[PDB]
Design a binder for these strands. Structure first.
Ligand SMILES: [Mg+2]
Ligand SMILES: [Mg+2]
Ligand SMILES: [Mg+2]
Ligand SMILES: [Mg+2]
Ligand SMILES: [Mg+2]
Ligand SMILES: [Mg+2]
Ligand SMILES: [Mg+2]
Ligand SMILES: [Mg+2]
Ligand SMILES: [Mg+2]
Ligand SMILES: [Mg+2]
Lengths: 56, 55, 129, 88, 106
RNA sequence: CAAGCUUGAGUCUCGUAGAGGGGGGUAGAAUUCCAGGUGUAGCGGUGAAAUGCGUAGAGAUCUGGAGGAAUACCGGUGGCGAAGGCGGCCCCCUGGACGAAGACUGACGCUCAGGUGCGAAAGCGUGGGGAGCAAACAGGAUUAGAUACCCUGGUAGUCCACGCCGUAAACGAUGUCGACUUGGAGGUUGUGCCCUUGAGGCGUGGCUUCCGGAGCUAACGCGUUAAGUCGACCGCCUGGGGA
């Protein structure tokens, strides 16, 4: 996420724009996922469980 | 019909950071999302498209 | 594989009756026609038809009395895996006589009653009730 | 697999005509050609276990066809094995 | 005969060797009964990311129809050559002769 | 036993999708390390700590370089494979599947005790390789104890070649092949047709997911991808522990 602060735009709006760009790019989510090792069996188990949850 | 040389069309299916946009967002067909990803990767290698938004 | 065409005919009848189907079609054979005859002559089916020359197809018109199929039970007795042959005196009677046992005798395919009257024995094809 | 030109050449040599493609002699020769060609592939790629399963299928298919021809016409079989240089 | 789309990018300091390279590559293809369908010198082009501390490199597109022998020695001559910073040979189902979006976007 | 027959099973032509296999190239991120610029007193770690690292200048930041291992996004109850399993990109060698149209062979088929081959990870042998991770082991903690869980390290191993081993909750805990039996909503991959199409409309195959009818089941559930209705052949079970 690369955010460029615009003319006559407050700091509060620029930071909120950055926080949304990080949320869109999944910055904190990709760091949470890579922090610790996950077994192929575990990531396959998670993918199956999420696919079942995506049925309402 | 899809080609790595057409960096014009290719730029529509990649994010601000250079990441390939998933089919769920773009609404493209399964067969052609695979064809796209190959072309984006072919164009990335040939420095016609970037890998990351750093360089 | 298609190792038992006879059990297939019986199963086609059995499943068709259960599925309230008006008719059942299957690849024909002399033996399938000889059994179709016995079934019609004993009132288990309406009528049978053999269409085609090179690839004959046997069609059987199923029978339905009131809310029910006429064929209550139809089982294969003698089979490729184990052949069942009985003497005139050993002939089996289905439902104590209320059903038929299709027997293949020296003088053709007939009921248990027919073979008993003709003093014959043979291969017990199936039981129909 | 075996090329369009290579397959067509075998069909003429072993078949009654250019369209007699199902003949057992044609079938056995088409398998013989591919079994022999693959010898070179498996000499360099000994660890190609997956493709070897497909080759063994060609070998077992050839054997079944050869045994079928042996009982249907002993003379046609004796000629075919001598023609493609195979024992049995 | 198989169809290939070759794309090689030459170091800008060696952009003068590029016509000579094209002449030699075409000669090896045509010499082995092969045919050349499309050739496009794209010239110096700006890189999306830097490769070997470089920005910009000379690009050349080639749609060839040639045997696997001359396409193999073409792949080795690209490895051996220090001028070619990147190359990519891609097999294509059928020959193509149409202005690529590089000719069309100018 | 003889002669057939073309619907089973093959062969042929053109295509289509695929992390199917084997080999060889190659790419960009990141970690660690080495070398240098800036900078200055902390860094790291935890529940809190401490061991550890740093004034021989760390950490942080920037630049150049070495090396190994793995391929973000795409990515999906997506796909491929007999199972094990298979994921960056490019080429070469190669196996299978499916579709459309005819032609060809003429039951050449199904199953399979014994036999043969394949077979995750760990482990073994010889020689390489070694960045990260990490059995063992060492140190710091926690605790009544703590041969653990947590932290700082770290060897085999994980990686490559060639051999070996032959096992897994090796699972759908469901053997293989064939025929038959109401439906609904999707996903994926062929193909015939129709329209002025920058998409859809109507069919027809292959595979796949959820739900469900009859039937089946002890129940749970299964339900045209059956655990339903039948047939061919094989494997296996016969109370628990001992095993
Ligand atoms: Mg193939
Ligand atoms: Mg690096
Ligand atoms: Mg004939
Ligand atoms: Mg070892
Ligand atoms: Mg540890
Ligand atoms: Mg050891
Ligand atoms: Mg076991
Ligand atoms: Mg129910
Ligand atoms: Mg269900
Ligand atoms: Mg006991």
């Amino acid at each position: 996420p690369v955010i460029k602060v615009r003319e006559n735009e407050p700091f509060d709006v620029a930071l909120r724009r950055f926080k949304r760009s990080c949320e869109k790019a999944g910055v904190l989510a990709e760091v949470r996922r890579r922090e610790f090792y996950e077994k192929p069996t575990t990531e396959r188990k998670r993918a199956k469980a999420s696919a079942v949850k995506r049925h309402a | 019909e899809i080609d790595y040389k057409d960096i014009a069309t290719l730029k529509n299916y990649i994010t601000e950071s250079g990441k390939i946009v998933p089919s769920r967002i773009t609404g493209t067909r399964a067969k052609y999302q695979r064809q796209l990803a190959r072309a984006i990767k072919r164009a990335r290698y040939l420095s016609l498209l970037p890998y990351t938004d750093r360089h | 594989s298609m190792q038992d065409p006879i059990a297939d005919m019986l199963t086609r009848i059995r499943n068709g009756q259960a599925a309230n189907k008006a008719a059942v079609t299957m690849p024909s054979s002399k033996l399938k026609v000889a059994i179709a005859n016995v079934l019609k002559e004993e009132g288990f089916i309406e009528d049978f038809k053999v269409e085609g020359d090179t690839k004959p197809e046997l069609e059987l018109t199923l029978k339905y009395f009131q809310g029910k199929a006429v064929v209550e039970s139809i089982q294969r007795v003698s089979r490729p895996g184990l052949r069942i042959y009985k003497r005139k005196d050993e002939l089996p009677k289905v439902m104590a006589g209320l059903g038929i046992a299709v027997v293949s005798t020296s003088k053709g395919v007939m009921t248990d009653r027919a073979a008993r009257q003709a003093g014959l024995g043979g291969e017990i094809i199936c039981y129909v009730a | 697999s075996l090329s369009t030109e290579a397959t067509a050449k075998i069909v003429s040599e072993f078949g009654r005509d250019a369209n007699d493609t199902g003949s057992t002699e044609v079938q056995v020769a088409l398998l013989t050609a591919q079994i022999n060609h693959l010898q070179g592939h498996f000499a360099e790629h000994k660890k190609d276990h997956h493709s070897r399963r497909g080759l063994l299928r060609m070998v077992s298919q050839r054997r079944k066809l050869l045994d079928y021809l042996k009982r249907k016409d002993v003379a046609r079989y004796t000629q075919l094995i001598e023609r493609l240089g195979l024992r049995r | 005969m198989r169809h290939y789309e070759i794309v090689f990018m030459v170091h800008p300091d060696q952009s003068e060797q590029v016509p000579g390279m094209i002449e030699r590559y075409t000669a090896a293809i045509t010499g082995a009964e092969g045919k050349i369908h499309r050739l496009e010198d794209w010239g110096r082009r700006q890189l999306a990311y830097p490769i070997n501390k470089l920005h910009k490199a000379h690009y050349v597109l080639m749609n060839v129809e040639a045997p696997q022998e001359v396409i193999d020695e073409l792949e080795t001559t690209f490895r051996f050559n220090d001028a070619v910073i990147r190359s990519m040979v891609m097999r294509t189902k059928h020959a193509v002769t149409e202005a690529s979006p590089m000719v069309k976007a100018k």
